[PDB]
Each structure stands twice: as structure tokens, then as C-alpha cells.
Amino acid sequence: DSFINVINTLGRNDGAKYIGECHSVADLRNTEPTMDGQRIILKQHTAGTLLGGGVFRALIDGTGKTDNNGTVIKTVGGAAWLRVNADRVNPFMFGALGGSNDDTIPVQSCVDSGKATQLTDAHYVSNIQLKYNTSSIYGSGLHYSRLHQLPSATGNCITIKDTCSLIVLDAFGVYGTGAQQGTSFTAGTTGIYVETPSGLSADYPFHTTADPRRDLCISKVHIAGFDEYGLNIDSGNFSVTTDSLLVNHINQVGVRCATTDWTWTNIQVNTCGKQCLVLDGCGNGRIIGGKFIWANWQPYGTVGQFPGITINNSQNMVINGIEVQDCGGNGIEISESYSISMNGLNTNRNGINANNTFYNIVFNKSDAVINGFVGLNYAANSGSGANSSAGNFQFLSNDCSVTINGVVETGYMGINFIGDNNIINPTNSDLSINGLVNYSKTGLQTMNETPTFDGVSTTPVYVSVPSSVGQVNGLRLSQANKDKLLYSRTAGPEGITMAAVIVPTISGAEVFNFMAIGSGFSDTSNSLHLQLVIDASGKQTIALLLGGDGTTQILSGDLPNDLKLQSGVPYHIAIGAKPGYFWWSILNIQTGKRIRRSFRGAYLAVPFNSIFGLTSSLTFFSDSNAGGDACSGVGAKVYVGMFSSENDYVASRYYNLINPVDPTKLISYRILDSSI
Amino acid sequence: DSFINVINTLGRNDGAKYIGECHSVADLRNTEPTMDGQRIILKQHTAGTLLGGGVFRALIDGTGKTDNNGTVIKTVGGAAWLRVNADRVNPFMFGALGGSNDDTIPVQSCVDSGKATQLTDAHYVSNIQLKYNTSSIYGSGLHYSRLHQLPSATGNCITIKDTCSLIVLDAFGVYGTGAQQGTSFTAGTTGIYVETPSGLSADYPFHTTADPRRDLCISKVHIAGFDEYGLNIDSGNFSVTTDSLLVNHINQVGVRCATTDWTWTNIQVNTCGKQCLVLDGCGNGRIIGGKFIWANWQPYGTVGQFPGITINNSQNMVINGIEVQDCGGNGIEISESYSISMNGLNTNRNGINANNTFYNIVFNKSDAVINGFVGLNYAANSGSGANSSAGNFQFLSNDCSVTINGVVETGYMGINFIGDNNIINPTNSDLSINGLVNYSKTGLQTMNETPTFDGVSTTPVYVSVPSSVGQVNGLRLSQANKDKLLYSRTAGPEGITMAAVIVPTISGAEVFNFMAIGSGFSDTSNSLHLQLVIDASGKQTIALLLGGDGTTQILSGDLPNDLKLQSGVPYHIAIGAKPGYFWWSILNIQTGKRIRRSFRGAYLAVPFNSIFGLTSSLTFFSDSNAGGDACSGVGAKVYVGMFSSENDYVASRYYNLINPVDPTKLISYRILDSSI
Amino acid sequence: DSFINVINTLGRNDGAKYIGECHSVADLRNTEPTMDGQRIILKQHTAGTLLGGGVFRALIDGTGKTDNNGTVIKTVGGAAWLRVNADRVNPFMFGALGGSNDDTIPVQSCVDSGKATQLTDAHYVSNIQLKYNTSSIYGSGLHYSRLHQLPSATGNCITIKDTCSLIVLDAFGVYGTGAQQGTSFTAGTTGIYVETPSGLSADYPFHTTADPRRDLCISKVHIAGFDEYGLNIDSGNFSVTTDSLLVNHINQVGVRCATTDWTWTNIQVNTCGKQCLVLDGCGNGRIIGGKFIWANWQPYGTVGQFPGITINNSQNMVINGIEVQDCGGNGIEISESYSISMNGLNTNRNGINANNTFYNIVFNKSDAVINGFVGLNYAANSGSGANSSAGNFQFLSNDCSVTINGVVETGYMGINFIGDNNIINPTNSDLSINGLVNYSKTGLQTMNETPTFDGVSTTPVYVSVPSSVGQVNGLRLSQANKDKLLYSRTAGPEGITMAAVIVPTISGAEVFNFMAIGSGFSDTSNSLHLQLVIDASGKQTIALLLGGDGTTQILSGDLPNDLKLQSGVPYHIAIGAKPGYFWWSILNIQTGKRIRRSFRGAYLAVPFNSIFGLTSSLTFFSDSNAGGDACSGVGAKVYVGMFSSENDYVASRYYNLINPVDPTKLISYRILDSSI
Ligand SMILES: [Cl-]
Ligand SMILES: [Cl-]
Ligand SMILES: [Cl-]
Ligand SMILES: [Cl-]
Ligand SMILES: [Cl-]
Ligand SMILES: [Cl-]
Ligand SMILES: [Cl-]
Ligand SMILES: [Cl-]
Numbered sequence A, B, C: 001d002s003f004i005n006v007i008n009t010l011g012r013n014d015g016a017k018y019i020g021e022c023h024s025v026a027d028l029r030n031t032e033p034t035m036d037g038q039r040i041i042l043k044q045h046t047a048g049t050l051l052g053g054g055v056f057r058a059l060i061d062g063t064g065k066t067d068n069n070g071t072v073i074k075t076v077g078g079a080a081w082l083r084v085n086a087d088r089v090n091p092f093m094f095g096a097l098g099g100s101n102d103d104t105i106p107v108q109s110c111v112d113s114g115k116a117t118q119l120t121d122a123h124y125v126s127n128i129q130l131k132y133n134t135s136s137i138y139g140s141g142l143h144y145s146r147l148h149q150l151p152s153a154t155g156n157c158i159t160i161k162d163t164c165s166l167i168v169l170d171a172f173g174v175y176g177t178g179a180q181q182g183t184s185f186t187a188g189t190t191g192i193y194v195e196t197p198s199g200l201s202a203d204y205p206f207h208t209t210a211d212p213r214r215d216l217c218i219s220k221v222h223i224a225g226f227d228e229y230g231l232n233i234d235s236g237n238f239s240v241t242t243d244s245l246l247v248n249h250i251n252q253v254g255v256r257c258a259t260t261d262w263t264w265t266n267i268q269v270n271t272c273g274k275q276c277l278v279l280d281g282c283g284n285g286r287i288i289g290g291k292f293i294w295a296n297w298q299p300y301g302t303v304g305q306f307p308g309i310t311i312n313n314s315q316n317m318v319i320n321g322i323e324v325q326d327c328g329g330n331g332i333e334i335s336e337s338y339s340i341s342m343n344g345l346n347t348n349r350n351g352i353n354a355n356n357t358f359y360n361i362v363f364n365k366s367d368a369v370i371n372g373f374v375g376l377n378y379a380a381n382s383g384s385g386a387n388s389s390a391g392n393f394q395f396l397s398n399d400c401s402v403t404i405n406g407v408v409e410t411g412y413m414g415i416n417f418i419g420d421n422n423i424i425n426p427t428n429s430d431l432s433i434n435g436l437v438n439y440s441k442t443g444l445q446t447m448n449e450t451p452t453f454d455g456v457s458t459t460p461v462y463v464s465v466p467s468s469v470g471q472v473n474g475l476r477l478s479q480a481n482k483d484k485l486l487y488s489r490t491a492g493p494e495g496i497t498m499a500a501v502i503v504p505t506i507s508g509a510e511v512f513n514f515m516a517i518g519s520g521f522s523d524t525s526n527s528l529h530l531q532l533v534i535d536a537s538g539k540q541t542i543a544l545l546l547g548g549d550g551t552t553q554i555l556s557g558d559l560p561n562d563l564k565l566q567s568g569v570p571y572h573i574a575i576g577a578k579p580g581y582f583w584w585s586i587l588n589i590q591t592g593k594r595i596r597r598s599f600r601g602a603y604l605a606v607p608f609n610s611i612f613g614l615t616s617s618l619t620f621f622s623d624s625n626a627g628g629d630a631c632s633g634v635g636a637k638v639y640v641g642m643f644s645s646e647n648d649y650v651a652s653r654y655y656n657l658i659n660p661v662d663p664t665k666l667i668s669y670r671i672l673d674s675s676i
């Protein structure tokens, strides 16, 4: 009985082969069903691919159903084959082929389908538009599931239309011609563009017409390899959220935002020929967690300076926990902006295209309040000599109202005699740093202890100083007369800060005793000397001599020729000294260039507690002993204060290169313009 | 041979039609398998739908298996048909129909199934309960994949039970009757409710009994259109995380939290009839990135004031990077709360239901530390006249301990003579703003330069002032005697701040010279005059006259009648003047109402550097020239300080309307109570 | 006709049973296709499971295809069966069995497949390695979809190899032996390990070789029950993002990070035997939103102290919105670190393994700027007597540069006479708290009002004080002579702060009037008295007596014996008094132990406005009335300032236990070393 034959043949383990199937959707349009809900198997969407197959079910009355070439296939007879597919569509359902094929139309059909799209692979496209509240796109990774713009395509790889709201873009890549490290770009391309809204609807969230409320999430999306912008959110769009956005390898601007009312979290922008980020006309937005690196990337060819971040014509921005680092020009340029609030801000090792040239934050006609600032320049710290920022802050105008608090100078050792702020440009702007009172702006009454002048002849001699010192004469300093200023105050455990303008006359071999605590140099001298030593060949050494706590230590270094002090040039010379903490700084007041070193922890043999036992007195231009070395040149504006960190010292230099450090800690301040 | 006929018939491209299938799960329960793992095709869950079909496999011994009407279907004979389904379930598997159908039971079966639920569409429900660590729900968008509460249903659309922990709610909508803009609500509804735990388990995370550790994520979820609450997290629940939560169109309170120990990131709450957010009994929580807008939304009918945010009976809250904007009443009300820490805070343009009536932050028996404050009132800036906040801060009690730092007054031009703080209510609370020393609380010794009184007769005349001025008499100001105060101090590039109480006598046409720098008015006069001009018709003009840097400029405006100065009323009149930066403020000390303007950037023809060349002296009530115009009325409490921004000026007004601006910058302060 | 028989038999609703299928992939390898793209049904991967089945399609020419035991199955004949599977793979496709089975090889095949992996259930594994940019893993919950390390397995449950970048790990669990509350661990296990990179590639993101750019997201992942680490990110890895990471039940360290350049948001680490978090050698990273609780968890057996967070050898860290709470030892230990920036920081109720022993933040050779600090100790507030931190801050070295701002002492009532800072260890470090000038470091000139000494005999008597008071003698205080200091200053609405060193002689029953405002005690006395009352049995009472605003109130408490004042011991005794706000503090200057109470809100019958009407004078050691009670012992270092919160009082104690509170508010300071 051939009946048993058929059952046994169909019942073989490969028996499914005997059930015919549709070869293609083209074949499917010619296959009329004879039963409602009739089941058919589709081998593949397009002949020869083995891609896009599935199961379809029939509506003999295909009325109100439209063929879309993927999930709704209509017959010549008017029936509709409907893909059995509850949830997301993917491009292969609509004829995508992957590989080098142009899958633009299949991908466009997905996001137009009325369902969210799943990217299961990498698809080449030219330009895709997201139009509906169903146009979500989901992948499974930042790389392998992605849209890839064709090399010939220009414009926006993805455009979010002003009719599209409340979608999710999650965990997929958006790659352009330059996606791979060190490759070139197709001109005029953008990864994701959010167009300016052309209208406002009254039926949100069911709107079908233009509306500014994007109210959508771009989450774990990786944009790489575009020319003009990675992501460009144009004016008029509200509530475009980004979350874990990663932007790599952009010829020009990583991310541009020109709109209001949005929040981004954990954004990273890396390696852009121009800015990593442009905020232009932004307001009432939030960035929380941000990393902006390798802006103004030189191999991307852009001659010309561009900062890591431009904040232009913006207001009411709260920007917390971001870092700008390794950018070729300035770190952050704030221009014509109001009320920029930054809480936890890290800017270090920018200006990498030209050493000692650019600044980490550049203020121009802007107001800002910046808290939790940090900026440890790891190139200066390591001593690598790599190009880095001249300093932290630069004011291009003096109508800025700016408050800055944090660690303005980090306080590492200074192997190459530099740190975070190596050129300081003071300003008359309405500026407050670290809550420090600006001496030029205070009427506070303070102590002002009077030192005793001492010399072989005890009559002070006064001589001219350069006009940069802001006075006519200063105290004549000579080795022959041992000119010095003796304070009777002794150093205590709170520590001390000592500073003066010194105009050194540098000729032959010589020891300059700029300032001292106590005298002598031995296990029990309880003394500090800051010295400039010139050997007979002109080599210059800055030496800190410490004696106490049962031992002696020399912390000195030979200056490279380009950092040597110049005869007749005024320098602000400052030290902070306290148990376990010594720093010195020499500041050229005509160029603003600074050298410095700082000693804590393992650099100190002992904390030298006994220097601060209220027994060693303070002396300027020599030590407290009649035989000590003195100085050659001129002194002025001698300052004694209680201990200030180098952080606060540098902060106060932005007010003025030669003024007292901290009015609330001021103990003595002597101009020395023909008086003591 | 009919064998070939069968193979050729089955082998047609539509051959799958010949394989029978089950019409419904009801039919399936009557279909006994004869082989283990036997495969059957289910056409659809419910007859007539074409929805919920799939492939099932048989367990002849359905023992320990329970029929659930979707993925486990048991036969009369005791066998179990198991849906071939590795991962998530969706409501259509359990009989959902979508459209207008009540899909409550299918959706409840999904979240009770033991698998996570995928929402592929919009489903109407009455009330759903999440009970298990498997009760996750995933959608593909904030709108199209959603639960939709039936119009007749009341109560919670979703309840998270105290047995439910460690689930994810990701990328779907939760809509109620009022979801669409401008529609009404069903009474007593809540979007998502997290119930108060009834117990604590000892076997987390495998607990099957009540526990407070929710430890779950609500992520990219959109809640819209509910009455009482969008999201309501009740007391006793720990670690309910929200991430990119979006709440729209709530009749009453957008989000209520009444518990401890949680973190939210990037929350937005928009358009609520009462508060956007209520924190009531909260502690040890974090909000990072928040947008709270259109609270107290008038068309939602709630008569009565409700703030954008209520912080009540809470403690140890860290709230970073949030904004409160466009709310109908106060911005933020902090009541009976300890240790509220805010870092990066934006409050602007609230109080929109009644102009000049509400305040951006209202403190009542609370302590707070607020850093990075900003609040550019875009309505005042644009000059639209839209209703906006009276000012930034209001203290309902004087037992608050509050620190505020930031841009308290933004410093835009003031087209309508107003800005951010238009009514100032000073307080005796333990308050510190912008690190400013409160003059009423300091013993610091400062400079106090003595001006020279000048007049046609050089003997000062003193007359009564209103008691609000805090002294018996002031300096008689007259045009006939040209009463004035001449300081010999000249203005420098750091700038200057000048202020006084002036009680003007306003009668006919007249020029009041409130204060001046230098004298004359020409390309090279290096002068500033602040003037009140009254024309013969009573119209009042506030004019800033600047001469220097080779040109002259008039920055004046006619006051609207409601802003005119009133004869016999005391005003605090203050200016800040420095190169490129001029602001003036007139403050009615009896009503706290302020008018003001500020000039920087393009409003200035030149920076007027030469006004600040240390050649132009300071004068109150006239200028330094014998022929200058003077004033009519009384003067008192003359203040000279180094430059303060309007930001710091306004900040210090919260201490006291008439005291010195900044003790650390004070140069002169003359009461003028029968002395100079 | 047996043809009709076959059609009718196949057409039965169970007709699918007649289509044969493959019993196993082993059977499949022996099934040669005869048509390209031939369809076959696979019943199951492994015989007897009903797991892993599906549909496969044939490539007769299996060339360039490799058998992987799940989705690519090759025949003896060289053909390839390809699983119809567009998107993610799951372990059951590769032979996983779930339950107690070791599914390591199936799971490893998934993440090696070239597709992302979906976890649909809980799978036991030993060790899994993520190697490719396709090795993403997705679950549907933090618990039920998970990897579970076998009890015998050691090492890393998941290792991310240095070839793996740009993947997502989303919404699944990683459990070890100790996952369930209160269970033990397998030695040497780690949840997720990110290995140190062995090289750098030049073709990112298409690299196939080692690279430091992880650039991956760990999102909504739950790690529980491992020994050494929950998550361990080793040196050299960049941009490992965590987002909503939840770590529970770790024998040792919840999370270790030893690398640079990363951002975490909303991390929670709960219940670790050692630290919740170790940052060791970190730099240029961000943590935004963090909860670290129950570190140093005693039942996990680690004898020895470990902080909630170790920050060691790190720099340029921005850590915003975190909380450390309920940890067994110190809260946060910062060692050998630069530029640690914290904005919004909550540390409370740590040190729970030994009461009054540990500190919330411990600084050692580190610099930090901390803003928005809060730390309401809920155990002290509730009066539970549970073990809690001795105090907020401890400095193990004096070379730290630290700025702290916030609510250093919360200001709740003090039911057990304690609060947040119960032992205070002052430091000579470069420290600034709440912007307070350190009196030891200021040269500012202030008022110093001179009191009038009064006694039955009006000649002051001076007697010795302990050396801890920093002077030789103080003012002899006796009840017989009514020794007192009368200021003529009266209290005003701004309030007042009064403090002194008092060395009490405690013998029999006695009333000590430490200090007073006004005199008398009645509805209209407008008076304040701070009293120590000793009854005849030695019981001690600290009483605040308030009279005014029409009533009287006693705010007193009996001290527990262990908190009693000791005869001959010096105490710093301070009050702040203003309308509606009264606090007192008694500080043992030899042990640093403090007791205190604070009265606001409901504790006050009235605000006692009339005490501050400028009519009641200030008195030390008695009141302004000749008959008032006085003191027995010695007084020294009498301080009058304008009102300071207890917050600022405690903050200033970290500078020095006995110095003036606030130099900018200082009104009087009398050493009393043989003078008045
Ligand atoms: Cl073919
Ligand atoms: Cl010169
Ligand atoms: Cl010069
Ligand atoms: Cl039917
Ligand atoms: Cl009056
Ligand atoms: Cl009045
Ligand atoms: Cl079997
Ligand atoms: Cl002693």
C-alpha cells in the first residue's frame, strides 16, 4: 500500500525536505492561498541568498494591507501573506544581503515598518531616516551590529526627523569611511543628525506631525569615522538623551549640540580633527560623566587651533564629572556664555601640538563657576618632555565673572622644574580662585611685622628696579655688605610662606641666599636655606638646604640652560615650608614663565619637625647669622604669611604676579621702596 | 502511482498548507500526543485571531507541569504541550488581542510565567502585579510598546510586590487615560507603584517572601497620563534604580519617593498638576541628572500652589545636575530636612501662574549646601513679560543653616529693568552666600576712608530718614547747596563698587547725580555719572553716562510708571564699575523690589579703560566739579568697595538690604547719622 | 484512492507529527542533504533533552564552514547544516542542559560563535573567556538569567581578554558559591576579571590582537558570591564602563580598579568582607552615583580593618554623588593620592565593628577637594547605641592638602548627647573646612571687646591650668567670690557664639553657670543660662535655661556616668544662641571626646526672640546679676563671636580644640593668662 510508503518516507529524519516552499518573495506574490491563515514556508527573500526566509500566513482578503517587501507581501489576486513575526524586524527580512551590498532600502523599510529594528550584522547604507515613534534600532554590540555608510554616500548616515519621538537607539555601531584608526574620510558626512523641528504638535505623544519633543534615548551607540560630525543635534530639539555614547575618529567635530533642555550621561569623544564637543547656543542642559580626548588631532590635517570643547553663546549649563585631555590645542574655550556651572572638572595635558602654548580653560566674555577642579599634568609629572599646556587658565577679556575652586597646582615633585601652571597670565577680571582674597581688592587690616635691616653697614641702600616691579627703588643687595632683613618671628608647626621680588645680578661663581629659616647646616641646625648657586662656568643650581631632626639633606637641581635666571630680570621667588612639606617657585614677572619644585613624602629624609620648633627666625636675602652668604641685585615686596600650598600660591598669581599670597594669612609685607 | 502524486503535491511551493495544525489552545487540550516530544503546529491561541500561534512539543506524562494558557497546555489525557520558546514570552502567546481589548489576564500570565516579558505592541490592562525575580518587562520604545490602563480601571497600572527583586523594566510605555497632551484623567490611578515591604528575608537573592531589597532597574520607561502619581516608590524599599525615566502629563504628582538608599540618573518629569517630584521621608539617596518642568500646571485644574519639587522630612540627599523650570509656583520647597547637598543646580522662570510672586528655592526649617547654582531667568532676559519668579531664594524660618554658591544674579542686560532677583527678602538665618562675609556678623577691621563734605556752604546739614534706614538722620541733599561727598580716591583697573541709601524728594524736572567717577562728559572726560532724570511731565529716566577712551556713550532707559521711584521712599542705589563692565541697581528697601541694568560686551562702545586710569575721583550725590548737578532728599550709609559683580551684590542683599556689600573689599562706609 | 487518505491524514490538526526530524546533532552529521538550502527539523541538540532543537538548512558544499556544535553542523559528506537563526545564540543551541549540569563548553561556544549570546536561564560554568568584538552577553534580569560558577571551579568566572572590545554585557547575573546571603565561598574566585593588555593594535576597532581600548559597557549586571573580587579591572585597560552595576556578597573586595580613563555610573557594592571598592593606581576616572555599604562585614571572618573604599596611589579622580555607610571600619582611606575631587559625598554610620573607633574619611599623604559633604549618623540621631564612627575626619599625616565643605556636623538634637563628630583629632595639615579661616594661621585684625571682671572682691585671681590649655595660668573661678566676666554687649537677632576653656573642680552638690545672656529666669527675663548641675550623689546635669517670649523652658539632661565631666580636666565649652536655634558642646581637650545637644523646631516652646532684643548682656562664669551662681575651677581663652552653627564650630575644632571659632566673626578673645 503506497500509503504506508508515503508515511514512512515523510517520517524519515530528513522528511521535512518533502514539504515544498516558496523560492522568493517574487514567487510568493504569484502564490494565491486557498485557505485563510494558510501557512506557507518562504525559503529566502531573494533568489540565491538563503537569507530572509521564514513562515507566512495568508489573508485571502488583502484589503487595507500594503506590500512592504518584507513582512507584508501581496499577491496579484489581492491576498496578503503576513510574516509570522511577533516582535522586531531585521533588514534581511526586507532583502538585505550584508557583505559589500548596499542594504539602504531594506534598512529603510525596517525603520519604516511600524516595528523596532534589530541589527544582527553589519549593513552598508547611504542615508537612513527615522520618522516614526516605531523607528527604534537595537543591536548587540558597539561594533559588529552596525550601519556602515557607503564610501560614495555623503550627508547624514542617520537622520532623526522632526516627526520621530520616543524611540530608542541601543547598542549598535554607526561607522563611516574613516572608522578604522588612521584612515581618511568621505567629505560632508555625519553619523547621526537630529534635524531642526519645523513645527509643534498638540497631540503628543501620538503626534504624526513635526514636534520639538524628541524625547528619545541614544544608548550604548558607537559613532566612528565621519567627516563633519559624529553626532549633530540641531537647534530646537528637546530631550535628546545620550547614555554611554562613544564617538571615535571624526575628521572635524565629534559632537555638536545647538539646542536646549537635555541630559547626557557617560559620553566619550576620542580623536577629532577639530573639537571633540561644540556647545553652540545651548541652554539648560546637563552633561554628567564625560571624557573628551585627542581633539585637534594633527594627522587629521586641520591646520589651525580648535579646543577640546567649545562652549559658545550658551547659558545655564551644568557640566559635572568631565575630563579634557591630550587635545592638540586649548582644553575648553568658553565664549559669550552665561552661568556655566562645572562640578568636578579635570583638564590636563592639552596643547599637545605646540609645547607651552595653549591653556586648559580659555575664558572670553563669559561667566562660570567651577568646583572640584583638578589637572595633574602627567607629562610634567613623568618628566617625558611631551608637549603640554602652558597652564590651566587664560582670560582673553577682563569682563568675565569667574569662580574657580580646586587643585590649581597639583603639587608633584617637578623633575623637570615644571608642573601644571608654567606660564601665568594674571587678569583684572572679576575672578575668585580657591576663595582667596585678591590683595589688590581688599581693605582688610592685617598684622605687618617690621623686620630689622642688617648689613656690615646697617644703613639700607636703595637702587632702581625695573618698572614691572611697580615701584621706583628696592633694597640694594650685595655680598660685600651682607644686606639682609631679619625678622624675629620664628617658624612654627603650622608652617610659613616666604616670598619676594628679587632682581638678581648674575656674574661669576656665587651663592645667593634668597631666604632662610634659622642658620647653619647640620644635624641640629633647625634651618632652611633656599639658594641659587652659580659655578664658575655659569651653571645654575637651585638648592633647598634642610637641617634638623638629626640629619641634613640637600634637595637641589641644575637648571637646563633655557630655564636659567637672567641678570637684571625680576623674579617672584616664593617658598612654602612646614613639617614634611617644602615647595619653592621662581617666577619671571616679565614673561610669566615659572619653574618650581615640591618635596613631600619619600623625597624627604625626615619631616624636619625641629625647623618649626619656634626657635629659628626668618631672614630674607641671607640667614640669621652674621657670616651667611647674601645676594647680589635688588629686593622688593617681601612677604611673610602663614603656610600656603603651592596650589594657593599659583591661584593667587592669577590675580597678580608679585602681590601678597593670602591676605588672611599675611604676617608681613614690605614694599622696600626707600623704606624698610 | 499515487505515491509520486503525493510527493509532487507536497513538494509544491505552497505545500506547507497540507500539514494540518491546531486551530486553538482549546483544540490543543483535546489533542493527545502519541509520541514523546511530538511536534504540533498551533495556528493561533484563540479561534479567529491569527495571533499567538507557534510550535509545541509534547510530554505524554504531564506531571509536575501546570497549564498556564500560553506556553504550557495540558490535555484531558494528562499530557503537556510545551511552546517551543527559549527566551521571552509576549502577551499574544497567552491570548492577548491588542487593539481595544482588555489584555489584563494575558499580560498577568506573562509576568507570572517564570520568564521575562516582551511587549511587542500596545496592550490595554487594568492592574498588573510584578511578583517574581522573573517578572522583567522589555519593550522596544517609549511609546509603541506599552501597557495602557483601561479608562474604567483605577489604582496602580503596575504594582511591584515586595516579593519582586532583581528585575528589569526597560524601554516601554505605561500610559493612562490622560496620556495625550491636554486630556483628562481617571481618578485614583498610578502608573507604577512599589509597595511597602511587609517583611525581610534571610535568603536573598533567592527569596520567595517579602523583602525590602528591590534591587531593580526602571530604565528608559515612559510614564504618562495618570492621576495621583506617575511613579510612587513607597517607604521601606531599597535600591529602586531609575535610569532615563520619562514622566509626562500627570494630574497630581509626577514622582513620589518616600524611602531610603537609592540612585536615579537622568530623570525627566514634565507637566504635572501638582509637584513634579515629592521626596517625603527620604534619606541617603542620589539624584544625578534631573529635569523637572511645568509643575503646578494650571490647565490640570489644581487651584493652590505646589512646587516643582518638595523635599520634606528628608536627610543626606545628594542631588546633582538637576533643573527646575517653568513651574507654576515655587521651584523647590525644602521643609524639615537635614543635610541636603546639591552640586550643579539650575532653577529659573518658575512661579509662572502669578508674576513676581513665587521663589525658586523656599527654605523652611531645613539645612542645605548648594554649589554650582545657576538660574538665568530667560523671560526677564528676553523681555517677554511672561510671569516668572520674584527671586531665587526665600526663607520662611530663620533657624535654617544654608550655604549657597554660584551665579545668584546672572548679569544679562535687563531690557525691562529686571533680572533674576526682583524682590529680595533678607534673612537672619545662618546663611552664607558666595563665601561673602555678612557685615552684620563680622568683627574684621578694615580701611574706612573719610570723604570731604562739600557744598556752597561747607557745613553738613542732617535731616530725618525713615526708620527703615536704621538711623535717626542722614545727610541733607539739595540742589541749591550742591551737597556732596568728595573722596580723593581715584578709580583703578580693578574697578569699584559704590552704593548708598538715597531717600529722593521727587517733584519737578530735575537731574539727580546719585554718584560719579571724575567729572565732565566728553571723549576724554574719563567720567561716569549715574543719574535719575525727571522731565517736566514726571517721566523718570535712569541714565549711565560714560566718557573716555575717545568717545562718549549714554546708557539710559525710561522707567515704566510702575517702576518709578517714589518721593520719600528709601532706596539702596548701587553700581559696579570697571573696564568693560558696568551695572546699576535701585532697591526699594521697604518692599524689597529691585530694578537694575548691566552693560558688557556689545552694549559698550568701548571698555572705557581711561575712566580707571587712577585720575578720576569718587563722588556721592554729585560729581567732583563745583558746577555738577546734585540731588534732592537724604543720603545715608555710603559704601565704597573694590569691584563686586551684581551676582555678589544681590547675594549680599539676602543678608541685609542696606549694609556694605563685601567686608573683604570695603574701602569706606559712612553712616552719615549727624557725622561724615 | 490512497492519495486522499494521505492528504486527509496529513491534514489532521496533529498532522505535523508525520514529518520526520533529526533526533540529535550527532544524527544530523550523518544526514546528507540532496538539495541546496534543504530544510531539516532538529528535534533537540542532545538525545533525550528536548533542548536545543530548531530548523537547519543545508549547504551541500560545506567549504569554509567549521562545525561549532550548535549553529554550524558538518556532515561526513562535507555538507554544512546551518541553524536558521538570524540574531543571538543561546547555550541550549550548543548543548547546554541547565539545572545542575556543567554548561561551560556550550556557553564558551556561544561567546565564541561570532554572535552575541542570550542567557535565557541559569547556567553553571567553571571559567568563560570573552575574546571577540562579538562576545556580548544579554540576559533579562539580574537574577534568573545568569552564569553560575561551579562550586569546584576557581579563578575568574568571566575573563575579558585583551582582544575583546566594544561588547555589551547587559542585564544578567554572575553568581558564585557565596551568592546567597550568609553562605560561604570557593577560594580564589572572581566574578568578572578584565586582564592587563599585552599589546596595542593599530587597526581599532577592527583589531584582532591585544589592545588597551576595552570600550565596552557592563550594564545592569549583578555580581554576587565570589571570594577575591566581584569585579576586578586590571591595569592598562581603558574605558571599561559600568552602569547600574550591582555587587553583593563578596568575601573580600567588591570591586577593584587599577587602571585609568573610565566612567562608572550608579554602582552599588553591598556586603564585603574587606573593601567594597579598591582604587589602586587609578587616574583620570569618574564615579557618578555610588553606594558602598556593609564593607568589612564581620561574619565574613576577615579579622582586621578594611575601609569601605580604598583610594591608593591615585590621581585626578572625580567622584560625585557617592555614599559610604554601615561599613565595619573606616569609611574612606585616601593614601598617597593626588587631586581627588569629590562633589556630593555622604559618609555616615561606619566603624560598626567597634564603637567610637573608626573615622569616615582617613587622609594619609593625600590631597583632596571635597564639596557637598554630608554625614548624618542615623545611629546617633535615633539614639540606638549601635556602634558608629568616632567622627568624620582623621589625618594620619600633616603633609595633606585638603579642602572640605559641607555639613560637617548635621545638627540633630543629640538624644544620647552625641552626634556625627564625637572624637575630634585636630591637625596641622594644610586644611581648610567650610572656608573657615584657621585662627592659628591668620594675621587679620579684629575687634576685641574688653569685659569687666567682677567678684565680691573685684581683683582677679589667677591660678595654674594644665599644660594642654597652652598657657601658664587662668582666671580663678570660685562660688565664694562669684568670679565672672561681664561684657556690656547685648545679644542681637543675628545671634551669638560663646566659648571658653573651663577646668571645673567638681566636688559636692553645686550649680555651675558656665555662661549666660542676661539674668533671671521668668516669662520676661530674656535670659539664657548654660549650667552644669551636680546633685549630692554626684549625678551631673547639663541644663540650658531659656526665659522670654512670655514663657520659660528647661532643656536639660542627666549625663550617663561615662560622659561625666572630670574634676581638673580642661573642657572647651561652647554655645551658639540665636532666635529659634540653640546648641551647646562640651569637649574634653585631652581626649578629644565631645558631648553636645542642639535645639530647634519642636524642641523649643518658642523661638525666644526676646532674648535677642539688644537688652541682655553676655557673661562668662556667671550671669549679669550680683546674686547669680558662678563656677569652681579655672577659666581661659574666652571667645565671643557672632553666631556660628555647630557645623562650623566642629569644623573649626579640626584646626585646634581651644582656639577661636571663626576669625571673621570674632568679637572678643581673652586668653586670661594673668590679665583680663
Ligand atoms: Cl536558489
Ligand atoms: Cl624698565
Ligand atoms: Cl620691566
Ligand atoms: Cl479560524
Ligand atoms: Cl518711619
Ligand atoms: Cl520706614
Ligand atoms: Cl529521545
Ligand atoms: Cl599638666
Ligand SMILES: [Cl-]
Pocket (backbone or CB within 6 Å): C466, C467, C468, C469, C590
Ligand atoms: Cl594636660
Ligand SMILES: [K+]
Pocket (backbone or CB within 6 Å): A288, A320, A321, B288, B320, B321, C288, C320, C321
Ligand atoms: K554629578
Ligand code: NA
Pocket (backbone or CB within 6 Å): A016, A019, B016, B019, C016, C019
Ligand atoms: Na512542516
